[PDB]
Amino acid sequence: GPVPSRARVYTDVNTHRPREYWDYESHVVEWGNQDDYQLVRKLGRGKYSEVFEAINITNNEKVVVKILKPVKKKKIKREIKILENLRGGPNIITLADIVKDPVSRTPALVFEHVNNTDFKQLYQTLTDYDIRFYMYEILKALDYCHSMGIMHRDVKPHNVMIDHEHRKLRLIDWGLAEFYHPGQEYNVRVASRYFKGPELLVDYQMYDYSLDMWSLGCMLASMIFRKEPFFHGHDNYDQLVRIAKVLGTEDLYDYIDKYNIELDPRFNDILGRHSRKRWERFVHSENQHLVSPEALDFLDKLLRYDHQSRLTAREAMEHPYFYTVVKDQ
Numbered sequence: 524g525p526v527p528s529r530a531r532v533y534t535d536v537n538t539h540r541p542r543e544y545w546d547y548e549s550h551v552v553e554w555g556n557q558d559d560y561q562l563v564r565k566l567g568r569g570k571y572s573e574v575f576e577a578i579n580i581t582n583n584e585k586v587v588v589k590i591l592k593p594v595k596k597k598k599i600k601r602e603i604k605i606l607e608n609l610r611g612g613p614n615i616i617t618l619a620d621i622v623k624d625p626v627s628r629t630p631a632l633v634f635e636h637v638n639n640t641d642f643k644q645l646y647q648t649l650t651d652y653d654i655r656f657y658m659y660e661i662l663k664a665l666d667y668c669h670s671m672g673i674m675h676r677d678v679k680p681h682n683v684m685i686d687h688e689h690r691k692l693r694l695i696d697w698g699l700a701e702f703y704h705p706g707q708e709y710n711v712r713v714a715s716r717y718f719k720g721p722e723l724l725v726d727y728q729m730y731d732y733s734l735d736m737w738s739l740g741c742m743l744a745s746m747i748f749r750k751e752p753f754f755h756g757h758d759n760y761d762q763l764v765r766i767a768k769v770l771g772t773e774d775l776y777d778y779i780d781k782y783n784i785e786l787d788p789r790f791n792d793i794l795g796r797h798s799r800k801r802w803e804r805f806v807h808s809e810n811q812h813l814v815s816p817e818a819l820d821f822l823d824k825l826l827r828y829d830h831q832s833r834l835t836a837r838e839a840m841e842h843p844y845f846y847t848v849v850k851d852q
């Protein structure tokens with residue numbers, strides 16, 4: 524069968540913590556008073572939750588209430604446990620309270636409020652510098668959670684909340700995140716299609732934090748080339764097709780060899796032969812003000828089939844692309 528794998532960094536971080544740190548199944552939830560919050564207006568909805576602006580009538584503080592739809596109790600315990608473990612880390616959304624409606628009995632998480640409502644315009648007026656800066660803030664959060672033994676597994680634009688007025692950014696929706704344990708085999712059905720890593724697409728289950736680094740690359744690429752989504756895949760098979768027509772197929776079959784991955788016979792007829800394209804081809808007159816040698820050298824080191832050879836968050840944070848942002852701080 525397939526050749527095993529381990530994270531290059533933070534490998535045994537959880538082995539060294541006490542059991543309860545990662546054994547979320549045994550975590551008991553500190554519920555609270557659902558009557559301290561009142562819903563003002565709805566802010567969004569998704570397959571696993573509906574999000575409201577709310578006010579804590581205890582302190583007048585405005586707040587975000589995320590009402591969970593039916594999942595397994597352990598999935599909830601998982602999100603709750605990861606959020607508490609990460610509370611206070613750089614640019615992690617703060618879980619404030621945990622309440623359950625008395626009659627409905629649907630659980631809900633209560634978070635610090637981050638002012639977004641600005642995204643659409645902000646998305647197409649970020650300067651080259653804004654992008655470097657906000658990418659640096661994301662990496663701060665990824666490095667933290669990785670060092671804390673946690674994969675996010677759903678890195679993507681909509682899971683980043685930016686109040687540009689206060690250059691403030693939080694990484695949200697930890698519903699998909701797990702703890703990394705060496706030699707564990709994880710579910711490949713995670714993350715949005717356009718951001719799924721090659722390991723998930725070919726069904727290699729012993730993946731790790733470097734999965735988030737791939738998704739960062741896709742985020743970065745669409746921002747700097749002004750192409751959303753970058754890898755515009757019709758479904759999970761054609762998404763590996765779309766990657767291969769940029770990264771080339773030779774590096775892909777090398778990846779498959781090295782880890783002795785068993786390709787779904789479906790891919791046989793659709794992966795083709797494709798050379799590895801030069802990034803220059805995505806550069807046109809309307810995005811070139813966000814494209815630079817440093818940005819492309821950076822991008823190329825995130826988007827590798829071989830998850831072991833992608834930049835780690837800390838390593839990313841040191842790349843030349845970020846010299847100017849680091850100099851300001």
Ligand SMILES: CC(C)COC(=O)c1[nH]c2ccc(F)cc2c1-c1cn(CC2CCN(CCNS(=O)(=O)c3ccc(CC(C)C)cc3)CC2)nn1
Pocket residue numbers: 566567568569570572573574587589616634635636637638639641642643645646653654657658661679680681682683684685686695696742746
């Ligand atoms: C929606 C549910 C399905 C799940 O919800 C939550 O789980 C949730 N949980 C919260 C906790 C606290 C809270 F305060 C809100 C929330 C929310 C929550 C969710 N939505 C909805 C969208 C959130 C993202 N918006 C813009 C995208 N990011 S963006 O513009 O800021 C940007 C800029 C630029 C980039 C480029 C990079 C260089 C950075 C990327 C992203 C669109 C609206 N609203 N609130």
